[PDB]
Design a protein around this ligand. Structure first.
Ligand SMILES: [Zn+2]
Ligand SMILES: [Zn+2]
Length: 189
């Protein structure tokens, strides 16, 4: 359906499709909370459906995620003032996003354990344009596709660990890839 970056609202869900234009990345909206993405020798992309703005709602999602190479399935979003990109990583394939970060703790929620990390990005694409911003990570120890994410438990754990959150911008269930191929079909319930 679309092959270049776009945001909108479809069947009552915010959607964000971002690609740096590398290889081929194809996104489609489905009924209700559903989206599909297919990608071949991609650059960096992030795609999904959810809310704008995010509250700190309990997310339920279903579907399938079939990467061949580097990909993450995550609750993904932004805060503003301060500018923060955050990830609650449910699965990653061939590359752990927290590589080269101090573990700041763990949080137990939704029948799993998540390792907490903070990174910085310098002169990087953001919802505000080229910027410097912190990235917060919750990375599940037992990878899964589907289930419940109690986002407030992650936000509270990050704040407990001294990681400041801003005003919530969007929050989506995202499929991310980098220099990989794959497909995914995800429904936000
Ligand atoms: Zn995995
Ligand atoms: Zn398992």
């Amino acid at each position: 359906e679309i092959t270049s970056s776009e945001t909108g609202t479809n069947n009552g869900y915010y959607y964000s499709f971002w690609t740096d234009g590398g290889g081929q990345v194809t996104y489609t909206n489905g009924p209700a909370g559903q989206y599909s993405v297919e990608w071949s020798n991609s650059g960096n992309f992030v795609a999904g459906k959810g809310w704008n703005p995010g509250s700190s709602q309990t997310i339920t999602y279903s579907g399938e995620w079939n990467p061949n190479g580097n990909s993450y399935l995550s609750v993904y979003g932004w805060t503003q003032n301060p500018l923060v990109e955050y990830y609650i990583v449910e699965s990653f394939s061939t590359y752990d996003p927290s590589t080269g970060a101090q573990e700041l703790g763990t949080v137990e929620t939704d029948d799993g354990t998540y390792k907490i990390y903070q990174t910085t990005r310098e002169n990087a694409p953001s919802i505000e344009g080229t910027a410097t911003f912190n990235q917060y990570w919750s990375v599940r120890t037992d990878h899964r596709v589907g289930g419940t994410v109690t986002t407030q438990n992650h936000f509270d754990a990050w704040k407990n660990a001294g990681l400041e959150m801003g005003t919530h911008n969007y929050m989506i269930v995202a499929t991310a890839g980098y220099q990989s191929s794959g497909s995914a079909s995800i429904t936000v319930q």
